[model samples]
Each structure stands twice: as C-alpha cells, then as structure tokens.
Target: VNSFSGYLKLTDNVYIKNADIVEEAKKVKPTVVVNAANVYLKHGGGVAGALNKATNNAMQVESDDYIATNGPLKVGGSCVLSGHNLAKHCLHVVGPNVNKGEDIQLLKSAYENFNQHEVLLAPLLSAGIFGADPIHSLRVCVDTVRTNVYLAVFDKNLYDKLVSSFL
Candidate 1:
C-alpha cells in the first residue's frame, strides 16, 4: 500500500524522503544517485541493476570503464560517472560485505566519500547482501554526510522504521 511520500526535515540542513531511487534519479535535475555496488561494481543485480536498467545499461559501461581506467572499487571507496538520463551524474559506492568479515568502517567510508555533490538521492548502503543493519546505515549517513539527503524506502514498513529511528 501507499504511504507518506514527501520530504521530512531532520535537522539544520539534512532531509529525508521516501522515493524510488531509479525514478528520482531520472527526474531530479543535478542529483547524484548513489549505487550500492560490489567491489567489482557489477550492475548484475540490486541497486546497480536497477540503475543500469534505467540508463539503458550505460551505467554498467561507465562502471566498467571506471575500473578499466582506475581499478576495482574497494569497500570504502567510490567513483563517479555521467548519468545517461535525468540525473547529472552517478555515484558508484562500494559497501563492506560483513559476511566476508569486513567491518562497519568500510561502510561508513563509502558514505563519507560523498564529496563534490550538493544534492544526493541514496538508498541505505550495505543493508542488503553487505549485511548492515538498516538503522545503522541511516545513522552513518546522518552522522557523516551533512548535505540534504533524499532516501529511497520501497515500502511503508521501512518508512516507519526510518521514522522510529529519529523519535
């Protein structure tokens, strides 16, 4: 079922909102959509897959090219690429895989690396296969990044969880 779909101000400058990251990226001007990619940055599934699909697979090509020029992404690292559609650019973030003994710092580092962009639309990093607690993901995001954040929560349950974390 549908739920609240508007922005909520959490602090002096921080904000959160429920949205589909893919749709928001394709519509928000100058927004940089964050991708929770593996170190390989493959767009085979999950967030990467969705962005790649929305960009007609261009996001994958850029991700590949980024690796070819630089190197495979590390857990705490990220890179940027031009968005083929509405978003001005894409921020490819590598989250730590705790299942592989990776620590939480790596996850925070990925969020910490969001520099040079003013507006960001992101999903909770490392909350899936990477094994991060969803609330911890939001905490690191709120603790590290100071810019306005538009968060994508796909369901009403998760949206309520996000709200509960604050109050």
Candidate 2:
C-alpha cells in the first residue's frame, strides 16, 4: 500500500469570447505572448502559410517580439522550439489540448512548459483560448506550465503576455 496527498483543482465551464480577447490583454502585465493561430495562413495573406510562417515568425519573436501564439496543435510536440522560435528571449508556451481533458495529459503538457524556464514558470502567466470559460482556460493555462504563474489577461492577453515577457 502507498499513500500520497495532493490537491486536485477543477475549474468551471467557459465559452470563447473572441471579442474581448484583445482588451483583456492590456489589463494584465504580460511577459510572453501566446497565440492560437491557424496551422497555415500567416505569411501568405496571413492564411496561406500560416503554420509555417507563424512558426517561422515565432522564431523571430525574440524577447520583444509579439506573436498570435495560434495554431491547432501544430506546435504541440515542438512547443519549446515553437516558443523559442516565437520568443526565445522570453520563452513561448503551447498547451497540447484546446479541448482534450485528463489530468495526466494536462500534467504532461504543463510539465513541458515548466521545464523550459529557470525559475520554474517565473515571469509566467496562464493564458489560452478555445475553452468552455475563462476559468477553464485559466486552469489549462495554469496547470500546463511551471510555477510563478501570474494569469495575465486582456481582450487578447496570451500572445501579448508572451511578447511582453521579452521586456
């Protein structure tokens, strides 16, 4: 027999509020900007080579560059590289599931984000889109990264924060 103690936090449901996304970002002091962009539609008219271009542009994000952080798991396996590609000076984070649930899955995803930084998520903020509600996205964002998460928000805070972190 084995015994271990831990706390499991579940958040309420949320719906996508695409309208206020940009505004919410301004309120929160962002460090890194995370965006949810189409896999293909960023460079060519911002929709033709979105995935390739987004990833490539992300590489140019550096510490002060801002990105949409958008993609349908296009940068899933390569989130670190993607973030680095997007904001190497600041650190880019991409969660695996926009809707998938399961603590193990969430933990794994979060672990990936946490491992990249030195402060274990310091100068970090929980942010993401495509969720049932704000809390749900918050949970996914908080749970999918390291410690020191300062849940940033704005009409569109995720990507903004990712960009700001460079400063």
Candidate 3:
C-alpha cells in the first residue's frame, strides 16, 4: 500500500486505522464525515459526541435548524450538518442502536441512506457506545460503502485485528 498517510487499505475502497477521528478527517478531507446519529438528533456519545464537541455543538444547531422546517429526522434516514471543524460536510445518519437490536436490515438501510460521494470518513458503526462487535460492524460498513471510505478506529486491539486479517 503506497498510502502517504499510513492508512492501510483493507480493500479497494476501504481503509482502517487507530487515529484521531477529526485529524484523519482533516488529512483525508473527505467530501463528508458521517456521524452515526440516533432518531432524536442527539449526538452525546461515540464518534458523534466527539464530532459534536469538535464543532462546538454544531450538530445540535444544524439539526434544530433543519428540523424547524423539514421536521424530525427518522431512523434509517439522514440529515446534513456543517462539518465546521471536521470535513467539508457532516452527514448524520440514523444508524441502528445495536444495544436495542435494531437488526442488520436497518443497519444496511442506514448505510445505504447516505448520498454517494468520492470519499467519505465514517466511524465503525454500531461498534462504539452502540456496543456491537467492531469487526462485524466494520465489515458491514465496508460492504455498504459505495465509494472510497476511511474508518476511524480508536482501540489498538480493534485496529490490530482488522489490519492482521485484511491488510
């Protein structure tokens, strides 16, 4: 892999690493950074929380701004927020809360909901505070991503397992 950024490509369109999510987004400069938001527009934990904080709570502001006219975002849907401090754009996809067993069907639906772009930076959905197995969740994300995607992983163990198997 001749990646200048040290991001090991798992497949033609998938890459993974243990790095700062925001920094990686800044480096890659993907078209958008996808946040795994719930139905309520609350981004209080996991990547969403970090991103929300990074942007000084811009997610809430955007959601409220959007909802004021368009109505509440539903599960398996998506809303766009400004990636003011992350990427060129921020995509909030209502993903499955695996703790509630929203099922792979909805998971895939959530993954499919986003608009296709040349490059996307996303967290390993359902794996963080959502509590799903990291590897499995990553597989689903990689499979569902339509364009080039970079996955941000925080845990060294999870990063190791993914790299050992795929890279």
TM-score of each predicted structure versus truth: 0.88, 0.35, 0.87
Q: How well does model 1 score by local distance difference test? A: 0.75
Per-candidate RMSD vs. true structure?
3.8, 12.7, 2.5
Q: Candidate 3, residues 74-140: lDDT per residue as tens digits? A: 6678877778867788888877777877775677777775436667778777677886777777777
lDDT of 2: 0.33
What is the lDDT of every predicted structure here? 0.75, 0.33, 0.75
Off by over 4 Å in 2: 1-75, 79-90, 96-111, 119-129, 156-167
List clash counts for every candidate, in order: 0, 46, 0
Expressed as tens digits, the lDDT of each residue in 54-151 for candidate 1 is 88888778778888888897888888777678477778888887777888887778888675567777888888666778788888888888666677
TM-score between candidate 1 and the true structure? 0.88
TM-score of 2: 0.35
